[PDB]
Design a protein around this ligand. Sequence first.
Ligand SMILES: Cc1cc2nc3c(=O)[nH]c(=O)nc-3n(C[C@H](O)[C@H](O)[C@H](O)COP(=O)(O)OP(=O)(O)OC[C@H]3O[C@@H](n4cnc5c(N)ncnc54)[C@H](O)[C@@H]3O)c2cc1C
Ligand SMILES: Cc1cc2nc3c(=O)[nH]c(=O)nc-3n(C[C@H](O)[C@H](O)[C@H](O)COP(=O)(O)OP(=O)(O)OC[C@H]3O[C@@H](n4cnc5c(N)ncnc54)[C@H](O)[C@@H]3O)c2cc1C
Lengths: 450, 451
Amino acid sequence: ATHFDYICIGGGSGGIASANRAAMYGAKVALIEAQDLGGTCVNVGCVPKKVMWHGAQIAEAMNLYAEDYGFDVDVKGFDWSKLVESRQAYIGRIHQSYDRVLGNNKVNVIKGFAKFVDEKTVEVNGEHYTADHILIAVGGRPTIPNIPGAEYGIDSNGFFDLAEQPKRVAVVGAGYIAVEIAGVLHALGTETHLFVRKESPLRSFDPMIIDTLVEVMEAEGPTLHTHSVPKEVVKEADGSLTLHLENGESQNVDQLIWAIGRHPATDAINLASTGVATNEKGYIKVDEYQETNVKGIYCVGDIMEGGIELTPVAVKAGRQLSERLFNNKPNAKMDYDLVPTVVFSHPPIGTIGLTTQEAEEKYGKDNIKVYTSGFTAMYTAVTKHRQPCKMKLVCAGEEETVVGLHGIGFTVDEMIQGFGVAMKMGATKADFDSVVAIHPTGSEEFVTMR
Amino acid sequence: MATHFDYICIGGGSGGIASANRAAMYGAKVALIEAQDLGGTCVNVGCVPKKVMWHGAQIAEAMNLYAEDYGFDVDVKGFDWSKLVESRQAYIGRIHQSYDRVLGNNKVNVIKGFAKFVDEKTVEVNGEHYTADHILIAVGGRPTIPNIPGAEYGIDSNGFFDLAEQPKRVAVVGAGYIAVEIAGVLHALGTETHLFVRKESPLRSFDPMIIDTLVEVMEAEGPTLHTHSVPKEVVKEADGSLTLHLENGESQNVDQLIWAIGRHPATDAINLASTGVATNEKGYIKVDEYQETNVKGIYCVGDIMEGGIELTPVAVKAGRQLSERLFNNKPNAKMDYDLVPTVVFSHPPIGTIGLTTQEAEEKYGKDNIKVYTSGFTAMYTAVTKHRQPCKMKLVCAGEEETVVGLHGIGFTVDEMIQGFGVAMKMGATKADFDSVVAIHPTGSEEFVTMR
Ligand SMILES: Cc1cc2nc3c(=O)[nH]c(=O)nc-3n(C[C@H](O)[C@H](O)[C@H](O)COP(=O)(O)OP(=O)(O)OC[C@H]3O[C@@H](n4cnc5c(N)ncnc54)[C@H](O)[C@@H]3O)c2cc1C
Ligand SMILES: Cc1cc2nc3c(=O)[nH]c(=O)nc-3n(C[C@H](O)[C@H](O)[C@H](O)COP(=O)(O)OP(=O)(O)OC[C@H]3O[C@@H](n4cnc5c(N)ncnc54)[C@H](O)[C@@H]3O)c2cc1C
């Protein structure tokens, strides 16, 4: 068996981040990837989703706002396949950047599907590879419900595989993926239906964010269907699919997307040969240093128990692990607190920290203070299509530490990173008040609340 | 006899309104004197109209430059400038209704007319005298028109917003942010635009990374920049068009000429010589840290302040803190002029806070500063045939690497710096920037992933 200082299983967000970083400090690294480098994010996640989000934003601009700004515009047509080739060409340039970076760091990239043989050895393409340190970063895959006709639906992967625009779509799920896809499809001219199992989408978000997303969907977005539990998917004689709900109602569509969750891909790598512990749902257990119960085996990214399913989390966790193992920094670790999130819905959502109710449960109702700002972005205020924007700061203690920050509206996706640094430094309402506002922008509304 | 008020604010702009309202919130009987339209420069002929038209320009760029690469077959049959003016002024009108409502609920007595001082404690408007123990001068500025032949054929920022039809060709004269914004808006909206600067480049007080990037983006897809261009004369040709003549011998035939060479304060013509209040060579009023002049009871905020910052939020906060001090008995309340963030709505937009690379070298010493930078293409334009560069920089000082300067230019940069402004007020170091987890995919994550 060939020996390496470090073996990274999975060439996704975590694997690449960790493999490069460990190589920078002179390590001989083997990076094992079965499909394409960059994993879910680069190929069938963040990147392609964003490229289409931008396209959808251009549509909204021409369809909803252009006219009122004085433009006589005629959108003659939208070619979905043209968007796809631009998207995939961009994804291609990303693949060659990685091959240049990984090449310059001497990371040995091995194309194949890795399985464990034992604690210290993995097999790929019939060959055995051994190492002192082994990172498991295989990520997840979409969860397909166990009902009749489930196989007729597609998942987020199949959606990015669509060569042409479906005429009508049922998006099933309440998480950010379902909301993002449902929003992009509607903006691009597809009859879109969003089916959520209970009262609303994004149930883990602040009520202000939920309520505004809901009202904006009702007026200019996909059609929302609450209390919708799938029962069956019937393939009709004409080729369309009919989603039957447990409540008795049904909806006919051309394509149906399952966006009901993801589960870790830890069931086919022969873990039962390593002694590595996992929880009931297949997630790998780790200490604060990304190390499993078996010394020399580590884990970062989506498959980690108590992790966060974002790309920057896996990147940072992987890099900090490489700092620890190869750059003599035993305290180097990942910080999973106050990680910012952005949902590229229509309109976009930005959030950091605790919701109004989470802060009430943690600190007590009377010990928290909430500041809000409701406004119309100037961008849409001059048009027939007024869009609301809402922002909120959730404060706790007498010092009014900003324990939660929430926003929904035009360009909110871009205004959150900086407030995240401030919150990481323990910012209080007074710290927010100490800065002079930038006029005219949407971001000043975060610092002008009283 | 003179009518007595607790407070008199001369000028109903950004500083005047913010201060009058705030003082009134605490029970002060206030008189707000305004000669023209409430809201002043910002609302009527500044920030607001400028931004509305910047959005129009952004929509045009989305359709002209990016639409087809995203798959859209678009026919841009025409752009109607008058419709944009109609929408822009309709919005401004709704802002005026808000101010009438708010000033109304606070019981601020709004007086329409031009105010002149009578003495230290009294001002005259429409023949009547008004007096008070506290008087705030917040008359703002006015565009500077150069004294050269045919200068009167040119217009200024005010005249630009008075245009009811799109001019075909325009010469924007100036190197400041106003010239740059107007030139970029006109170019994107379909006007042949020529920007004339007197020296090596526009925005010469900004960091070299910001200048070099704006220059290279203009050269490729923006207005046509003319360096070392000193206006000599403006000729009114027989066909109605204007020819700009430069000292170096060059010339340019255009339809409208916009002077954006600076602004001077509107402090003359209000009889200040009767108050004892001193002004510098350029007409600015000197004040202490609490906005008070050398004459007790006379204050000043906004654009006319010596050593002040000519931005609306600066006037607004300085006016608010002055009222917190005078009418809510907070003797330590004042305005903090350090680390004020700035945004220029150029194409593409610029965001900046604190010191430039060179300013940090002069203050801390070349050897004690570290510069971090990120060069990338925003995903929005990387999928197109019109790739646009984005540049960001963090200027750090000391062994702790305190971020004393932050600079950016690129798509959406305008909205990403307010938050970093909070962090820098809290004394953020490079390690504070590193301690946050990036948001992907955004342009903003580039500020926190530098190594
Ligand atoms: C539709 C969608 C949109 C998303 N949008 C965003 C977003 O906007 N922002 C954001 O931060 N996050 C987003 N995410 C989440 C993000 O993509 C993941 O959290 C991130 O990719 C996790 O990285 P990872 O390294 O844990 O796994 P991955 O990046 O998925 O990497 C796993 C890799 O390992 C490979 N692999 C699996 N098994 C084996 C084996 N046995 N041998 C070798 N290789 C193997 C896979 O082919 C894959 O390349 C999105 C996810 C989805 C599904
Ligand atoms: C084209 C342009 C674009 C700009 N864009 C921005 C931007 O994007 N962001 C930003 O922050 N800033 C911007 N500014 C600057 C901003 O508008 C000013 O800094 C701000 O308005 C200053 O407020 P002020 O209270 O000092 O004076 P102003 O707001 O100008 O108000 C002064 C008021 O006093 C009145 N007045 C004058 N003399 C008298 C008198 N004798 N009696 C009674 N009333 C009188 C005037 O009519 C006026 O209403 C811009 C300026 C211009 C010219």
